[PDB]
Amino acid sequence: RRQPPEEVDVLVVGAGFSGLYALYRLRELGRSVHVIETAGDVGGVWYWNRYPGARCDIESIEYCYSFSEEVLQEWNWTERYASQPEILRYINFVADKFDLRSGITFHTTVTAAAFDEATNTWTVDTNHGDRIRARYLIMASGQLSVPQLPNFPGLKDFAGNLYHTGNWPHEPVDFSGQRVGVIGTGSSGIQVSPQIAKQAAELFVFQRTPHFAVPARNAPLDPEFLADLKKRYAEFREESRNTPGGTHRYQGPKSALEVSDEELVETLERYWQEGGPDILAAYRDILRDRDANERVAEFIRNKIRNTVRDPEVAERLVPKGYPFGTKRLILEIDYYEMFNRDNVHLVDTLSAPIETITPRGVRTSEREYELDSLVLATGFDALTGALFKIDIRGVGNVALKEKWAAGPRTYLGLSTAGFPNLFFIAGPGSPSALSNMLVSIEQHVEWVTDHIAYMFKNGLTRSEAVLEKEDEWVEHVNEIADETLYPMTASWYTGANVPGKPRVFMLYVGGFHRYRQICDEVAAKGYEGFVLT
């Protein structure tokens, strides 16, 4: 409805945390800037994922913007870990406060973008037949998207109520009196299930791969504490910027292998009772050493066995075969405890795979389960999923999809050679999903918008990563990743390992603070590694 400009200094794709701050900062810097967003309003993942139990896995006081002193002073977080409704209210507050929606076109999807060498501009097309000419294109298009896979066979035949965690109804769903099925036990499944368990007459959880999850220990945020923090919030967030992960997480000095079974249990139990993801850094080698990881993994496995009364059910819930904590750690709220309710039933689909969804419910090899409601608790596509849905064409009409088929090739994760004037916020090649994303998003938006400002200040119009420096960066990312357990997780690679072909690990794992220092050095040296004309 709001018409996008025909010409703009910067076009931003996406109106979540990334796109909104890019918009705001480019305005402040005196540039012309517009946003295109698929959704009807702001929020990004916090707009589109609205299933009950959706909640951030790092603390509220950390997972927030810091760019505005007034925002910091005026917003009251109510809980240790904020719910999606609260996060969405916060994002709407920011957009409201700074009149940001005047700079956004909603209900509109960018379908293609092509670089034009003559003018040093991007021409961008949308699914409403808009054409925009921007000098710079910022992809604030996110890291998590709906997977592009067919649904289970027979899904369209289900005769009951069907829900998707990825597109949950806007009005509340009452499961009272119902036999409900939940398919999927990743992040969405683990968060949504205990909420459904509160209402359903019966609940069947269809679990394929068991995932690691630790207790949130969520609690109301003491108003007195928050008021005290607000007096020194700038000092606090500068402390967060100077860490590997972008939060105040204690860095455990010891090796998980150097302690007695006794000290390990004592230490890991303290983390279990405190709750949250800080357990990931209980010891220094959890993500470096195969045996160090398995030791922490085993303790968690035993917590599952301890919590779930039925030992057969408990054993099916235990993650096996793969390392702990190589992805964002899921916080659970009575997910394990849930299985002790008489009305909750675990269906192990590794043992009995789903044959088909039926009109009555779900059929495995063993039996049919009759259900009144079925919830699909879907996972997420590769980090590159959003980008790959757009036909992006660079120098020589090369498709970004083709160049990145063996993995995302970038310099600092910020730009790729052959695709001038194009920038990625919080994406492959940078700390991204392996950090407090609000800290990474702010660093990236500041770096990219500062760079765009510098260009205009010096009368330049074309910014391209130097190919040698991209190759060095890619290799450097691989080298440091190969020193960790992260490569053990298939989702951090695009496609399988093929002899005699390159393979690029998705993310920088060397620590946010170290990455920040690199980026600052690059900027200080006049953008060393970019060719600017």
Ligand SMILES: Cc1cc2nc3c(=O)[nH]c(=O)nc-3n(C[C@H](O)[C@H](O)[C@H](O)COP(=O)(O)OP(=O)(O)OC[C@H]3O[C@@H](n4cnc5c(N)ncnc54)[C@H](O)[C@@H]3O)c2cc1C
């Ligand atoms: C349940 C859950 C828990 C989370 N917990 C944590 C946590 O513990 N810590 C943490 O750091 N992060 C967490 N996150 C990750 C979260 O995604 C990021 O922190 C952050 O919100 C990403 O913001 P973004 O702006 O970069 O991307 P997004 O929020 O994904 O926004 C991208 C936007 O781009 C739009 N878009 C994409 N392609 C197009 C196109 N072609 N045309 C138009 N629009 C397009 C999308 O519609 C979307 O609105 C969590 C996310 C979820 C879902």
